[PDB]
Amino acid sequence: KGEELFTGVVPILVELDGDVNGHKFSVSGEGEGDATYGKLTLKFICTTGKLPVPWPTLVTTLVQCFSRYPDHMKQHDFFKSAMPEGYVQERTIFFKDDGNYKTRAEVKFEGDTLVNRIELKGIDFKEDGNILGHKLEYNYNSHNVYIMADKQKNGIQVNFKIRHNIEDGSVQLADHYQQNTPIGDGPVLLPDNHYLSTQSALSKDPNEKRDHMVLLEFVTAAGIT
Ligand SMILES: [K+]
Ligand SMILES: [K+]
Ligand SMILES: [K+]
Structure with missing residues (x-):
């Protein structure tokens, strides 16, 4: 079923359209995921110029189908089960004493590549808070x-x-x-x-030379005995 699409290394593409306090930007990412190991390897570029928010604030927005589900938890892996047609992922993220991001993404296969396409809107940020500052x-x-x-x-x-x-x-x-x-x-x-x-x-x-982030991640499911 969908789990079978993830047994080796899968290429990833990420595309994000953002607007935070009216500051518009776009980010593209590329790399690969290896769900057997729960590993992601990606590089992201701001294609519009300077990123108006810190890169770490975008990590969660920028493919939980690459989490490692141990054998005894495989019946709990929603994310791979939805593939290849994929899923909509929506969030609101509230930064304490600052603004919020609202995001909507579609995560699905396009050919052999797992693609995460996102729209992000941030509002009510402080001009010299931790995020815009x-x-x-x-x-x-x-x-x-x-x-x-x-x-x-x-x-x-x-x-x-x-x-x-x-x-x-x-x-x-x-x-x-x-x-x-x-x-x-x-x-x-x-x-x-x-x-x-x-x-x-x-x-x-x-x-x-562009504003960018290299990201490596390890993710493992747990909490079932
Ligand atoms: K800084
Ligand atoms: K600064
Ligand atoms: K760390």
């Missing part, structure tokens, strides 16, 4: 992403908190509320409650 460290914490069948028993409702390190040594919370709904109408796996355990490392390409 670029006051975040260039790194990423490790998180638990909590997953539960949705009310309609059609997709999943997801909740978690991201912690962004700030350059003054404090931490700013980004409270995530997420819904995923299959694009096709045939059966998908509806999971028992569980979570994903995430870790990420960010870097730069020394030869890349």
Whole structure:
């Protein structure tokens, strides 16, 4: 079924159209995912000029079908079960004492490539807050992403908190509320409650002259015994 599409390395493309406080931008990403290992390797470029928000604030928006589901949890992997037609992923992300992002994405195959196409709208940001002021460290914490069948028993409702390190040594919370709904109408796996355990490392390409982010991530499902 959809799980079979992920047994080796799969190319990824990401495209994001954003508008935060009227500052418009676009981001393109490319790389590969290896769900057997829960690994992602990607590079993202801002194709419109300078990114008006910090790269770390966009990590969660910029393919949870690449999470590693251990064998005893495979009946809980909604994300691969929806493929290849894919799913809609919607979020609101509330930055404590600052503005919010609202995002809508479609994640699906296009040919042999897994594509994440996103629209993002951010509003009510402070002009010199941590986000528009670029006051975040260039790194990423490790998180638990909590997953539960949705009310309609059609997709999943997801909740978690991201912690962004700030350059003054404090931490700013980004409270995530997420819904995923299959694009096709045939059966998908509806999971028992569980979570994903995430870790990420960010870097730069020394030869890349555009504003950009190199991202490597490891994600493993857990919380079923
Ligand atoms: K700054
Ligand atoms: K900075
Ligand atoms: K890390």
